[model samples]
Target: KTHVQLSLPVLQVRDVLVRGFGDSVEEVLSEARQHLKDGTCGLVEVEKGVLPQLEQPYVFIKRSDAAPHGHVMVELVAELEGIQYGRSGETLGVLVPHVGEIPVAYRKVLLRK
Candidate 1:
């Protein structure tokens, strides 16, 4: 069987932060819109509430919610990387499925800001 492992120390930035939610799935998705902010677009996958101790190895943000969904939406932390050409790069959470493992650098486009 093929097993998937999630290593820590990931850098993920939050392009959008969805606070609360409604009832339906469409409501949840519709409310979760991407945000184009300035500065390094990369996000750190930190533990619980403390943002200082942000995790590395990958760039992404996750919100903890008690509501229906997975609770929080883990947005990718994108910023000035080699892949990005300008201020705007690839959309967050858009996945490129692969059969094997690939370095986050080769797989992702850094959003320059």
Candidate 2:
């Protein structure tokens, strides 16, 4: 099987997006059952896929969106929130080609704070 690798930040759902997803985070996730069960959401493995690159460990919390070839999988490992910068501390955006817009992977810093 071909493994895909992408560097992304793993963060709390609350801290990732501004204005919080409200109390319906659970409801929103329930709607994603189709993607998860269909294998449309990408897989992650330690010492392998995108997990190792992350600063800590996390689980596949949800699948936000998907495409024909690739998809956006939102993950939740623990509780980490901050400016997850690259080697040069510059902004880095990971793009899923032909999948969707907004290359941002996970929540980095609060938009309001």
Candidate 3:
């Protein structure tokens, strides 16, 4: 037998909100799963229930305690040891609201850079 240990990078997520009225969790999440299953870049599309005025394609790779909402990230997608905090789903609603959905409806935090 062979022994091996894969020390992979740390990647995690919270939920992003829909900028518009917000979509039904189940409806969006099912498709989200398929997208991620495709093994493509972990981004989903936002819809009418979603916002159209806000900037598109930002990230929520940062944290700010237990606030109702937090800010977006545009410079932190990369390979790393670990982050300092674990953001809640609220951040998802704000950060990528303009874009559409999370990775497979949730962001897969692999080493981006």
Taken over the whole model, the C-alpha lDDT of each candidate is 0.27, 0.27, 0.28
Q: Model 1 lDDT vs. the true structure?
A: 0.27
Off by over 4 Å in 1: 1-59, 64-67, 81-97, 101-113
Which structure among the candidates has the greatest TM-score? 3
Residue 107 of model 3: what lDDT? Answer: 36
Ranked candidates (TM-score, high to low): 3, 2, 1
Comparing 1 with 3 on lDDT, the higher-scoring candidate is 3
Candidate 3's TM-score reads: 0.25
lDDT-wise, the better of 2 and 3 is 3
TM-score of each: 0.19, 0.21, 0.25
Error of 1 at 109 (Å): 20
| lDDT by residue (tens digit), candidate 2, 1-113 | 13222333433222222212112334323322333334223222223243334332122333332322343333321212432221122222211111222332443221100
Tell me how many clashing residue pairs each candidate has.
Answer: 19, 2, 8
Off by over 4 Å in 3: 1-23, 41-50, 53-113
- Candidate 3 per-residue lDDT, tens place, 1-113, comes to 12111111111123334321124333333333333234422332333544244323233332222321222221122111233122343232222222333344343232212
Find the 10 residues in a row with the least total lDDT in model 3: 1-10
Q: Could you tell which candidate, 1 or 3, scores higher by TM-score?
A: 3
Q: Report each candidate's C-alpha RMSD, comma-separated, in the order given.
A: 16.2, 14.4, 14.2
